[PDB]
Design an enzyme around this catalytic site. Structure first.
Site, short mmCIF file in Angstrom:
data_model
loop_
_atom_site.label_atom_id
_atom_site.label_comp_id
_atom_site.label_asym_id
_atom_site.label_seq_id
_atom_site.Cartn_x
_atom_site.Cartn_y
_atom_site.Cartn_z
N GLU A 1 0.78 -1.26 0.00
CA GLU A 1 0.00 0.00 0.00
C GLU A 1 0.82 1.31 0.00
O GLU A 1 0.69 2.12 0.91
CB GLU A 1 -1.13 0.01 1.06
CG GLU A 1 -2.30 -0.94 0.79
CD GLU A 1 -3.42 -0.47 -0.12
OE1 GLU A 1 -3.22 0.51 -0.89
OE2 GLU A 1 -4.50 -1.10 -0.08
N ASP A 2 1.65 1.52 -1.02
CA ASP A 2 2.46 2.74 -1.17
C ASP A 2 3.61 2.94 -0.15
O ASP A 2 4.07 4.07 0.03
CB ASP A 2 1.56 4.00 -1.34
CG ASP A 2 1.20 4.44 -2.77
OD1 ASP A 2 1.27 3.58 -3.70
OD2 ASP A 2 0.79 5.62 -2.96
N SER A 3 4.13 1.87 0.47
CA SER A 3 5.29 2.04 1.35
C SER A 3 6.47 1.30 0.73
O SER A 3 6.26 0.60 -0.25
CB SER A 3 4.99 1.61 2.79
OG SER A 3 4.85 0.22 3.02
#
Ligand SMILES: Nc1ncnc2c1ncn2[C@@H]1O[C@H](COP(=O)(O)CP(=O)(O)OP(=O)(O)O)[C@@H](O)[C@H]1O
Ligand SMILES: [Mg+2]
Ligand SMILES: [Zn+2]
Ligand SMILES: [Zn+2]
Ligand SMILES: [Zn+2]
Lengths: 46, 65, 33, 84, 134, 56, 56, 263
Positions: free
Chosen positions: E3-5
């Site tokens: 998730e976008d990390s």
RNA sequence: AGGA
């Protein structure tokens, strides 16, 4: 030993007290820097 | 701003290899891809270190105090 | 003849000191070329 | 007005909100050093003790279920079914 | 890295990957109040006012300024200033509570008027950590 | 925002190192959270009564 | 709407969020620093007396 | 000759190519990890600054000083300060280096790994000497000065491992490969038309036989034979990054046995 | 003036 203030451009040591005029003893420019501690700084090299 | 000692990715010492890389380019009239390779920099991680460096120190040195 | 206030000057404009300054001068002047 | 025990028409089952409020109230009470009506089988959390009191159905509380008119039915935590 | 990390090479970070310098200049000036009532750049003690900051004044020198070497931390007083009344009220400038670092450059000048003007640059090094954005 | 009943949920504390709140990935959808730099709020109940409300 | 419907509150914390596959659906990773700030007021009871005496 | 075999393909001052045979992957890898992570080295870990008139920050320079590779040949006859019984440090547990540089010249004055001087007593042991692999004998370029630009530091180098900080990394990249012909099917090649065409062939293909299409899948087949290359930084010589890796891993295991004994 |  001991140099209270340093001139910002000509870099000449000043060593002045409170009420002794915030100006260089050669040129003009009222800038003046503080000159780092005699109390020495230590860093972990990481 | 001043050559990094050691490649971030693998850790190969790169701190010494700067002055020479600049000579192989001027004095030896070489191209970057060869100069780098002569200095032993084989892995692309090591290559980007020297290749993509911007030695800003040289500008800062130009100010009087 | 008569003083009618002060005008803020835009840096690097004709009236600014840096307009005419060379790289070597700007470095002396503690300004980024 | 207060509806009599015969004539009570609300659920014979305890509401999710009732159960929560009872566990909370008893945990708050046990925690304020109130007497416990169950053997704490090595128990120390007032909420865990409250669950045990509700399980053994030894909680001396009553739910006053108000109706929109203002009237109400009183229900013992003893008599309320816990299918929750 | 869901998730976008992302996952970063801790080893690389040690070697200097993505490290940054952070500076901040705290500033102050001695104020003159009509009837030649001036403020003072000094290290204050108790003296009838007692209105002083909760943190150390000890890093200050006799001019009410930290030397350009000193490690600063909590609400350590960086600039010492006093305003007396008809005596030493505290007007001392502490390091932003949330921050810390090392005193970098102290500048002692003159106001357009002729008052004591001071600027204090503090420097920290910020190392890539877990919540950091890229 | 907090446009949902589920945009505020009760969790079990897990004290951990480093400066970020860590959440299970499946819980990401009800909150509408992602990790491109989102921040979240934590509220500690001070009662035995409020704790129950949260857990129950 | 500013001070009654909504309010600023004590026992509240906020930081950046990040995902963890090693956390259980219902737990939350709480940074140590945050746990050392947020407090819960526990009552001195015989069940906890010894434990609490140690945390003090 | 014994259990797992070794066959050096190419040796040098700072690189060792060899083929590890008669082993489990789990062991070649455990060795791989140790060489990166757990062999001790000597590195500057405390920098005390007296003067800096440089364009670089005290800590920026400090960081660099740590990364400068130091002689860690006799690292085993030095103590970890943690273990040593002194207030802070001493000769039993540290090496003390000094650096003083000033721009006397009009031209830019450079500051090198060589400019470091040992001020502590080395108890006649090969340690602390800055590694100079450089052609002109200078080593790492720490800094650059102009005129009145001065630098004064005292450095305390200490014994440590990569797990604590990568500056104590005895080795650079470690090349590792097995099954150049994918006979074990430990990979599934992404392709467009032909996997065999689109994917380059390994140099190690020469040291193993091609699969030969007219053969059934060898499921019984296990992974042994590891084509590896260990590269040293300078602190410890190539052979010793291998040997000390083997010894470190060995001690690590032996500790578990001893732990069970106390139990 | 910036952040999801
Ligand atoms: N002005 C605003 N007010 C309230 N919520 C906002 C907002 N702007 C953004 N958000 C929230 O932040 C979320 C992410 O939006 P963005 O940061 O732009 C990435 P995205 O549009 O979701 O596409 P992506 O997941 O494929 O990258 C939104 O779905 C929304 O909940
Ligand atoms: Mg987002
Ligand atoms: Zn001057
Ligand atoms: Zn590399
Ligand atoms: Zn010692």
């Amino acid at each position: 030993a001991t140099l209270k203030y340093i001139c910002a451009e000509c870099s000449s040591k000043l060593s002045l007290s409170r009420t002794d005029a915030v100006r260089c003893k050669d040129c003009g420019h009222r800038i003046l820097l503080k000159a780092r501690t005699k109390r020495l700084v230590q860093f972990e090299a990481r | 701003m001043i050559v990094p000692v050691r490649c971030f990715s693998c850790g190969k010492v790169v701190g010494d290899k700067w002055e020479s890389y600049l000579n192989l380019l001027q004095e030896d009239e070489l191209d970057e891809g060869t100069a780098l390779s002569r200095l032993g920099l084989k892995r692309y991680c090591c290559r980007r270190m020297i290749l993509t460096h911007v030695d800003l120190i040289e500008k800062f040195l130009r100010y009087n105090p | 003849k008569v003083f009618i206030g002060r005008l803020p000057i835009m840096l690097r404009s004709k009236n600014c000191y840096l307009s005419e300054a060379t790289e070597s001068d700007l470095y002396k002047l503690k300004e980024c070329p | 007005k207060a509806i009599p025990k015969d004539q009570r028409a609300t659920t014979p089952y305890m509401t999710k909100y009732e159960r929560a409020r009872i566990l909370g109230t008893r945990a708050l009470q046990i925690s304020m050093n109130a007497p416990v009506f169950v053997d704490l089988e090595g128990e120390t959390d007032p909420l865990r003790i409250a669950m045990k009191e509700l399980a053994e159905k030894k909680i001396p509380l009553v739910i006053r279920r108000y109706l929109p008119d203002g009237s109400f039915e009183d229900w013992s935590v003893e008599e309320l079914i816990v299918d929750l | 890295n869901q998730e976008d990390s992302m996952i970063m090479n801790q080893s690389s970070i040690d070697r200097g990957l993505f490290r940054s310098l952070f500076f901040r200049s705290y500033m102050d000036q001695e104020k003159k109040y009509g009837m030649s009532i001036t403020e003072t750049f000094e290290k204050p003690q108790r003296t009838n006012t007692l209105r002083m900051k909760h943190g150390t004044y000890d890093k200050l020198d006799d001019d009410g300024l930290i030397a350009p070497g000193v490690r600063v931390s909590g609400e350590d007083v960086i600039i010492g200033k006093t305003t007396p009344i008809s005596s030493k009220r505290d007007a001392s400038t502490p390091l932003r509570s949330t921050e810390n670092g090392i005193v970098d450059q102290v500048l002692v000048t003159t106001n357009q008027d002729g008052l004591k003007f001071v600027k204090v640059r503090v420097r920290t090094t910020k190392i890539p950590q877990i919540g950091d954005k890229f | 925002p907090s446009l949902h009943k589920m945009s505020m949920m009760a969790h079990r504390v897990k004290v951990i190192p480093y400066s970020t709140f860590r959440l299970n990935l499946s819980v990401t959808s009800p909150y509408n959270a992602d990790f491109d730099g989102d921040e979240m709020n934590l509220h500690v109940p001070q009662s035995e009564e409020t704790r129950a409300e949260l857990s129950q | 709407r500013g001070n009654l419907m909504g309010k600023r509150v004590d026992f509240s914390a906020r930081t950046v969020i990040s995902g963890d596959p090693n956390l259980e659906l219902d737990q939350v990773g709480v940074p140590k620093s945050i746990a050392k700030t947020l407090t819960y007021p526990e009552v001195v009871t015989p069940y906890n007396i010894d434990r609490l005496t140690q945390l003090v | 000759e014994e259990g797992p075999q070794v066959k050096i393909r190419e040796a040098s001052k700072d690189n060792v190519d060899f083929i590890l045979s008669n082993v489990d992957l789990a062991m070649a890898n455990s060795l791989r990890r140790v060489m990166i992570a757990e062999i001790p080295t000597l590195a500057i870990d405390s920098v005390e600054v007296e003067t800096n008139t440089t364009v670089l920050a005290d800590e920026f320079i400090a960081h660099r000083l740590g990364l400068i590779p130091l002689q860690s040949m006799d690292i085993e006859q030095l103590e970890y300060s943690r273990d040593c019984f002194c207030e802070d440090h001493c000769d039993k547990c540290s090496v003390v280096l000094t650096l003083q540089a000033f721009g006397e010249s009009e031209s830019t004055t450079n500051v090198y790994s060589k400019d470091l001087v040992i001020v502590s007593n080395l108890m006649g042991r090969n340690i602390g000497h800055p590694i100079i692999q450089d052609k002109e004998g200078n080593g790492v370029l720490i800094c650059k000065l102009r005129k009145g630009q001065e630098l004064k530091l005292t450095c305390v180098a200490k014994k440590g491992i990569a797990k604590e900080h990568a500056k104590w990394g005895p080795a650079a990249a470690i090349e590792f490969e097995y099954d150049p012909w994918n006979k074990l099917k430990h990979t599934d090649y992404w392709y467009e038309q032909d996997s065999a065409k689109e994917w380059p062939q390994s140099k190690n293909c020469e040291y193993e036989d091609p699969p030969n299409e007219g053969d059934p899948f060898d499921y019984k087949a296990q992974a042994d034979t590891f084509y590896m290359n260990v590269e040293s930084v300078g602190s410890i010589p190539v052979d010793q990054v291998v040997v000390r890796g083997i010894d470190t891993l060995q001690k690590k295991v032996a500790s578990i046995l001893l732990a069970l004994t106390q139990m």
